[PDB]
Amino acid sequence: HHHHTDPMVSKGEELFTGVVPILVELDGDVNGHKFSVSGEGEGDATYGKLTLKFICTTGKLPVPWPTLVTTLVLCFSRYPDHMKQHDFFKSAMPEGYVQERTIFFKDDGNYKTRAEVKFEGDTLVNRIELKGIDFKEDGNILGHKLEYNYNSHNVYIMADKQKNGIKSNFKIRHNIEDGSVQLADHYQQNTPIGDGPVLLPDNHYLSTQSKLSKDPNEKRDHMVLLEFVTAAGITLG
């Protein structure tokens, strides 16, 4: 199914051959409201395709589900063949990487997140802690004014040579029920859990596309996610 002249690329592609099961577990605290989310599903890195069901395990979710989408596995991005030498995410597996973000909601609070992404047996696991502070009690977030939908985005990736990983920033657009949008500026860094070597990329970006839905038989608070992610920004011609 795969054939790449670089054995570091081959290693990454071999782990993400076929369909891989995905487990997600998050503990969060926003403005004093603690909550937990479990997620299960599958990724097909060949098509940069994810499908996941998330359940709030503490009851009702105290923030809008779309605010957690970026928090709740870029190792499933589809990198075009001519760009596979730039895929940090697969090259850090199976030991994994740490993903850390600060998400600034313009004119509102911020999310601080830390995640370990790694294999446990055959399963790709994403375990996350989230701290949210300085949110307005009647703002778009705690007021629950975001529409249940999602826009397409560009995630810019640059090497971080001294941390042996990558840094990233990007702006997320959350549609609001009145017509406006709520902006969420993401700062992000990923560093490998292992000590071995990784692929440090040239500058490039990921094109993301996401669709939100509901399991009509599900009475718990939940979100179903379909997500496509493709690396781009480097030319072959």
Side-chain angles (χ1 to χ4, degrees), residues 27 68 98 126:
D27 288 331
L68 301 182
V98 173
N126 176 23

Side-chain angles (χ1 to χ4, degrees), residues 54-66:
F54 303 98
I55 290 143
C56 177
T57 51
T58 48
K60 197 172 132 65
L61 188 70
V63 298
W65 281 107

Side-chain angles (χ1 to χ4, degrees), residues 66-67 70 101-107 109-111 135 141 146 150 153 169-174 181-187:
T67 69
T70 54
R101 288 209 185 101
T102 305
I103 309 161
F104 302 87
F105 290 90
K106 215 160 274 202
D107 310 301
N110 59 53
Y111 286 169
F135 281 90
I141 293 84
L146 306 195
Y150 216 79
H153 294 108
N169 59 66
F170 54 96
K171 180 210 300 165
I172 292 287
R173 291 154 193 93
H174 295 296
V181 300
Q182 169 69 64
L183 295 178
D185 295 299
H186 286 56
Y187 285 53

Side-chain angles (χ1 to χ4, degrees), residues 112-123:
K112 287 156 56 48
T113 67
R114 193 181 182 270
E116 299 186 1
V117 184
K118 64 162 174 285
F119 276 93
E120 291 288 342
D122 284 357
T123 302

